[PDB]
């Protein structure tokens, strides 16, 4: 507190940490979704939800409490009978198309990362990226 | 042992920050500065120089 708050030593991992740059020497960070245990758990939860959704009845109308103003005469069709059925179908199908969304997302991410050094200014303009792109084109 | 853009930028920024923090006297680097100087190693090297000089002096 009173004295120098840094106290650099000859470790370079405490020295780098004390000045802010700690994770900046590792390739990729540490995350939670990278373990098979959490993956199995998430898959279990998703399968349970899909099971519950599929065990619903097909005839799943909804009484909307605003049908009062629509003077239904036992022959007309209520304009809101399919509102919980539509939501159930939407959730079920969205849960069944998860891998497709994952694939499209990873395609987008890869095709936007591969062009980082060409589309992002502060990466394209550093002397090191420019030097590397020049070094590749040496005839 | 590998050098990527991230490593290079981190190294350069670390050097710059260390230098500036030293300008403001916000860092105490006695351990590094006395492991590089190593006054024990200084005395050892000085005595070795003296012995070698005496050896060269007495061979004549």
């Amino acid at each position: 507190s009173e004295k120098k708050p840094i106290k650099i030593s000859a470790d370079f991992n405490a020295k780098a940490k004390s000045l802010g740059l700690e994770s900046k020497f590792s390739n990729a960070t540490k995350t939670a979704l990278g373990d098979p245990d959490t993956e199995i758990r998430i898959s279990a939860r998703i399968s349970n939800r899909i099971n519950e959704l599929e065990r619903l009845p097909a005839n799943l109308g909804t009484y909307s409490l605003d049908d009062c103003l629509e003077f239904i005469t036992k022959d007309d069709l209520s304009s809101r009978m399919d509102t919980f059925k539509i939501k159930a179908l939407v959730e079920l199908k969205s849960l069944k198309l998860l891998t497709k969304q994952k694939s499209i997302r990873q395609k987008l991410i890869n095709n936007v990362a591969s062009q980082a050094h060409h589309n992002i200014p502060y990466l394209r303009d550093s002397p090191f990226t420019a030097a590397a792109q020049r070094s590749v084109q040496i005839r | 042992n590998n050098v990527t853009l991230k490593n290079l930028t981190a190294f350069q920024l670390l050097s710059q920050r260390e230098n500036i923090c030293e300008l403001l006297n916000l860092v105490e680097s006695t351990e590094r500065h006395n492991s590089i100087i190593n006054p024990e190693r200084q005395r050892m090297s000085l005595e070795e120089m003296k012995k070698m000089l005496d050896a060269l002096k007495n061979e004549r």
């Binding site: 507190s1 708050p5 | 300008l23 403001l24 006297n25 916000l26």
Partner: peptide
């Protein structure tokens, strides 16, 4: 907090 205190003390010692 105390970081600003230390930084400003260092700058004042540097400028004086």
């Amino acid at each position: 907090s105390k970081l600003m205190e230390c930084v400003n003390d260092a700058v004042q010692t540097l400028l004086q």
